[PDB]
Amino acid sequence: LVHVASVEKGRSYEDFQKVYNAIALKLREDDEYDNYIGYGPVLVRLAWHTSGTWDKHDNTGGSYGGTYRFKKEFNDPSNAGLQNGFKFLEPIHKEFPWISSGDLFSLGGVTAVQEMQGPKIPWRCGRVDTPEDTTPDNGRLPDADKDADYVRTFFQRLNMNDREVVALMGAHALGKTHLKRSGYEGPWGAANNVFTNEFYLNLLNEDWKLEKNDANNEQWDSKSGYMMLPTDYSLIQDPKYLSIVKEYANDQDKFFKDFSKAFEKLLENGITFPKDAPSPFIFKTLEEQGL
Ligand code: HEM
Numbered sequence: 001l002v003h004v005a006s007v008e009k010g011r012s013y014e015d016f017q018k019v020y021n022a023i024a025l026k027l028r029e030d031d032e033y034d035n036y037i038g039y040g041p042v043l044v045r046l047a048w049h050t051s052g053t054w055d056k057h058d059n060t061g062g063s064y065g066g067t068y069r070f071k072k073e074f075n076d077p078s079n080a081g082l083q084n085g086f087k088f089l090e091p092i093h094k095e096f097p098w099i100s101s102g103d104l105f106s107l108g109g110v111t112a113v114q115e116m117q118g119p120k121i122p123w124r125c126g127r128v129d130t131p132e133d134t135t136p137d138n139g140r141l142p143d144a145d146k147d148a149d150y151v152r153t154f155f156q157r158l159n160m161n162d163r164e165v166v167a168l169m170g171a172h173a174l175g176k177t178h179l180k181r182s183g184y185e186g187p188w189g190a191a192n193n194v195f196t197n198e199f200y201l202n203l204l205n206e207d208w209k210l211e212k213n214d215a216n217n218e219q220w221d222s223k224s225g226y227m228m229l230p231t232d233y234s235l236i237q238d239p240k241y242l243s244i245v246k247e248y249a250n251d252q253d254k255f256f257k258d259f260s261k262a263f264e265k266l267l268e269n270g271i272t273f274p275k276d277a278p279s280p281f282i283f284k285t286l287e288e289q290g291l
Contacts, residue, residue: 001058001059001060002059002272003059003062003064003065003128003130003270003271003272004271004272004274005124005125005126005127005128005271005272005273005274005277006126006128007125007126007277007278008098008099008100008103008125008126009098011098011125012278013278013281015098016099016107016123016125016281016283017281017283017284018096019092019096019099019104019107020107020110020111020283020284021286021289021291022092022095022096023043023089023092023107023108023111023112024111024114024115024285024286024291025286025291026039026088026091026092027039027040027043027111027112027115028115028286030088033084034084034175034176037175037176037192037193038193039084039085039088039112040112040113040115040116040174040175040193041112041174041175041176041192041193042081042082042084042085042088042175043085043088043089043108043109043111043112044109044112044113044171044174044175045082045085045171045175046068046082046085046086046089046105046108046109047063047105047106047108047109047110047112047267048109048168048171048266049068049078049079049082049141050063050066050067050068050102050105050106051063051106051266051267051269052140052141052142052158052266053067053073053136053140053141054140054157054158054269054270055136055140055157056157056158056159056269057157059270060136061136061140061270062269062270062271063102063105063106063127063267063268063269063270063271064102064127064128064130064270064271065101065102065127065128065129065130065134065135066100066101066102066103066104066105066127066129066130067101067130067132067134067135067136068082068086068101068105069086069101069129070132070135072132072135072137072138073135073136073138074086075138076138076139076141077138078138078139078141079141080180080181080182081178081181081182085108088108089104089105089108092104092108100126100127100128100129101127101129102127102128102129103125103126103127106123106127106267107123109121109263109267110123110263110267110283111283113195113263114283114285115285115286116174116193116194116195117194117195117196118195118256118259119195119256119257119259119260120260120282120283121260121263121264121267122260122264122280122281122282123264123267123280123281123282123283124268124271124273124277124278124280124281125278125281126271126273126277127271140157142154142155142231143231144182144184144229144230144231145217145218145229145230145231146230146231146234147230147231147234147237148234148235148237148238148241149238150231150234151165151231151234151235151241152165152238158266158269159265159269160262160265160266162240162241162244163244163258163262164258164261164262164265165241166235166241166244166245166248167244167248167255167258167259167261167262168259168262168263168266169199169232169235170197170199170200170248170255170259171195171199171259171263172188172199172229172232173188173189173191173192173195173196173197173198173199174188174192174193174195175187175188175192175193176188176192177219177227177229179213179214179215183213183215183217184213184215184217184219184227184229185213185214185215185219185227186219186221186225186226186227187225187226187227188202188226188227188228188232189202189226190224190226196252197248197249197252197255199232200245200246200248200249200255201249202222202226202228203228203232203233203235203236203245203249204236204245204246204249206222206224206226207222207223208220208221208222208228208233209221209222218230220232220233264280
């Protein structure tokens with residue numbers, strides 16, 4: 001299966017900037033969600049989970065088809081809690097019904113990273129909604145109880161290398177684990193709705209203890225009130241991942257640039273962009289627009 005990007009009829013940069021702005025303004029307005037974390041982190045995770053079902057071997061799953069709108073995928077246990085991001089985007093989709101579901105879900109992630117002061121993420125339009133029978137089965141999203149070998153093997157299915165994996169994982173600065181959603185509890189740091197390299201600094205600098213949470217699952221905890229999943233912690237157990245963690249801990253700009261590339265790639269996996277497609281768009285933030 002080849003998924004060819006097809007621009008929403010007649011639409012151009014300014015149309016999508018309006019969509020970006022509506023998501024950004026809602027993000028500002030609906031500030032109370034998740035004990036005042038706001039929707040930014042769950043939107044980044046929604047973009048990732050809608051993309052991360054991709055299999056490079058047969059081009060199944062991925063962001064193109066916007067299949068999270070179908071029950072099989074919205075009810076994936078791995079997706080618990082993402083319904084809050086979907087609900088957030090519903091009025092956006094009502095206002096701008098011309099946008100495809102995959103374009104909305106990926107653009108939600110981009111908007112969220114940028115509004116939270118993260119890097120600019122170039123984004124391309126043209127995802128097309130595909131039918132319910134194209135929904136990928138549950139179980140393509142990764143488990144958190146596993147080791148570095150698991151992580152490395154897992155992400156080969158998404159055509160990601162060590163650098164790309166370590167860079168992507170830095171999104172775990174954002175948000176938190178919720179015991180009832182995933183069996184893990186706690187934030188990864190202090191700045192959990194601002195996009196920084198804190199995930200890496202915390203890995204290296206905090207004094208981590210291996211504990212059991214109230215779900216009887218092991219996680220790494222610090223006295224500052226932070227946590228890491230076992231798959232997070234695996235990035236400092238494995239000597240290849242560790243070198244990269246150290247690099248991002250010591251160079252904010254490099255983390256930003258590599259994250260931006262890896263996240264755009266994640267979001268575009270599976271999609272064939274024709275040769276005369278528009279160039280990727282770089283959206284202005286609300287701050288840059290004086291809005
Ligand atoms: C080994 C790969 C990964 C595993 C096992 C994993 C696992 C998890 C788990 C268990 C949670 C907690 C969910 C909850 O209880 O609410 C979570 C949260 C999150 N993950 Fe991942 N994750 C991975 C990779 C990524 C990547 C690649 C991204 C994006 C680039 C990402 C973004 C997020 C975000 C933003 C949250 C916070 C969501 C919220 O606060 O509602 N994760 N992850």
